[PDB]
Symmetry: C4
Amino acid sequence: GSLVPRGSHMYLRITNIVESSFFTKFIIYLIVLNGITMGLETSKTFMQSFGVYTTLFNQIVITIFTIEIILRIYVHRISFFKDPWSLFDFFVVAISLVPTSSGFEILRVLGVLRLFRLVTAVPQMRKIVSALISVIPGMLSVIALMTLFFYIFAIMATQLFGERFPEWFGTLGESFYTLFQVMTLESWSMGIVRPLMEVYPYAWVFFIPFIFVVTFVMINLVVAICVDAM
Amino acid sequence: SHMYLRITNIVESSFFTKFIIYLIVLNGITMGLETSKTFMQSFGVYTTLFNQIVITIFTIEIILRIYVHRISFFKDPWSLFDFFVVAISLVPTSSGFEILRVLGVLRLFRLVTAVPQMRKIVSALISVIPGMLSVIALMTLFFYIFAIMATQLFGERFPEWFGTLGESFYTLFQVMTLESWSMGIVRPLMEVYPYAWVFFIPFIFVVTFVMINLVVAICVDAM
Amino acid sequence: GSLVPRGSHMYLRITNIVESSFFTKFIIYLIVLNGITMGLETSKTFMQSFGVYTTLFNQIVITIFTIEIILRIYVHRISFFKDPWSLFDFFVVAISLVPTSSGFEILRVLGVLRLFRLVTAVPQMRKIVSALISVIPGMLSVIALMTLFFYIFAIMATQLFGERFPEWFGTLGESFYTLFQVMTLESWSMGIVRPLMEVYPYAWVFFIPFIFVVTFVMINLVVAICVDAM
Amino acid sequence: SHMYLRITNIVESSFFTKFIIYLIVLNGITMGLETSKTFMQSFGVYTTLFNQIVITIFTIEIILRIYVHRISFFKDPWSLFDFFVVAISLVPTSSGFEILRVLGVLRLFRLVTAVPQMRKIVSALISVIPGMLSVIALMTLFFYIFAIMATQLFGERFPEWFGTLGESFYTLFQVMTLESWSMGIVRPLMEVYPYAWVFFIPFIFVVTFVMINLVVAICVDAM
Ligand code: NA
Ligand code: NA
């Protein structure tokens, strides 16, 4: 493979650096250091004392991480952009590269996602994430079914309850949101359906069978993962 | 037979199912759009005419499917669902109640009908239900007995929650889901009836114990 | 067996009556009839119209049921009082025999328990109750453990929170009650622990580990029934 | 050895364990009674003297158990628990905090220590925990990342729920238990931050998905 390596005179030179155990260790060390520093940046008292420290520390770590991804791309070439873990690394570092201002501060908040590089860089963490994720394919049909089910009941509820209950059902999205809440069973009766039954006494004919189905499916979804994994 | 084979090759074709599924999805999209009051002031007429067109196509389709499948049609659960959900959608713009207009949205479940693999998951989910009916039966009897009890123990001083058998069923269901059962129901009940806990706690143990066994059944009965 | 039968001249006479399929059918028929009549007695409107009907119907059914248990005891003799289903039958009919007044009306309400004779008299209902119940022996240790656990944390909470929160923790029983509620996770935070953290900011150090344990055990209890039954 | 064998037969005996268990249960009963303010006005002195007597016996017991078991004692988890829970109970009537007086009730968990079969269930429950640490670790990291995010997205306008990393941890735990997460937390958050749902819904999916897999593990890993 590798098609046309960078040398392989300096290709191998940087490859042994990148491929080393020290290289991974140092990076992980910085992940943990930056994770600690990010919790510290949460205190307004710490930021009034050591604000400058952590801010420069931050931009320093991010420079190292960018160089790291660059070195890893020269070594792994095309293989890099075919590796989900490396892709996550790339995108979570790229996010972190957007200037101190501009756009919105969501990009600054999403910067904290780089701490998930602990999962990337540490094996066994990969292994558990990998195990959890591979369970998802045998769920897509049920998820698909459930999504269609929510969509149909959201449309119904929007048009049955939206005019007299705009906050909870005024809009398709509002209805989706509220139906999700009912599925988690959070205040479904005292907070949503009892108030609904004061105008619409048969509202129970809608939410109870909704609750049976959504619950029945969730149970089968779990049993699936119990059986499909066992 | 004569023209029987003629329409059968139409109905039985790959094109025929595709076109129908295409209309399911199109009509499903059109139904979400009909939710927006802004969309309906602009393209209201469009979507309304689109709707009556789709429903006419679906009616012709079911007719064609019955001529081909004859008796087999009304013995097929999927076709029956198709039939009833299209018939629902045939009820006039007014008259009766508007539940029928709302029940029209149920025709989107024809996506399940028309797409294989969706049948498969619905089929898998449903076949799990027979080995549950005895437990369901037991639970229903249990709800019935405790609903009657709650009606006559708590109904006079707590009419909204227990004044009526139906109200009691409803409240007991809520307690089973554990939703506000204490802060919202049993603590208030205990300001009048301090031993109310002797009723709802064992009720909660039983209903929970059964649900756990009901699930374990589906864990076991399906495996 | 049977030691000394009643004859067996009339012993066999009543035995064939009692042992018949008709005998069971008739009784079941009355269970269902009385169950229907009991729901009807819930309506204040029905009781103003057909109150006399159902009340006499009730005392009639109860007389038949007492005769039934009597006939069953003469036939089954000692075997009767060794049969859990017959014992339930006996006690649920005896409850139903207590006079129209006297004591409390709990005895009138407990009368509705006789509808569970549907489970007794119908096979397959026995079978599911039997299946559910037999699962309980392999649970007694965990239940025992949990009961001890609740007892210890109830004592702790009574003495940590009872003075400033008499309703929720003023008394061992109040504490038991509240801890049960926290276990069902019902309003545990917004309704109990957040108000508790306004005086006692470390209350979370008590309820969070309580919630982990009680939840962890519940999960293992279920897995037990999953494995012990599978 | 000399008197080593003399006390060993005492400590190792069936009588010795029984008497101790007998005192566990007696002291446990006495601790519930000490909860009643009425009982304490009548028999307060009795139970207090009973308490110091039991604790002195327990201290002698642990000393005797250490002379017999020597090094083996401090390598036995059950004996360590015994030791620490008795030591806790040795702290003077005042000084420090009264948490130590409350932590004294933990000595009732010596019922688990002293009664076999109780060990067995505790042992079974605990051995299940090693095959969970990776998932626990993943979840803790996940909470940490989302807590930091919530602190800086919602902390200024919602100090009580998200003003501080610790507050955010607490609130996120609550959302994970699904307790009032919508009516009590996310709907209020959405009156200021209408896209807050983009944060809590995926948070709820993940935390739930993991819990389900965590359980399935214990279903599988134990079977
Ligand atoms: Na409300
Ligand atoms: Na409160």
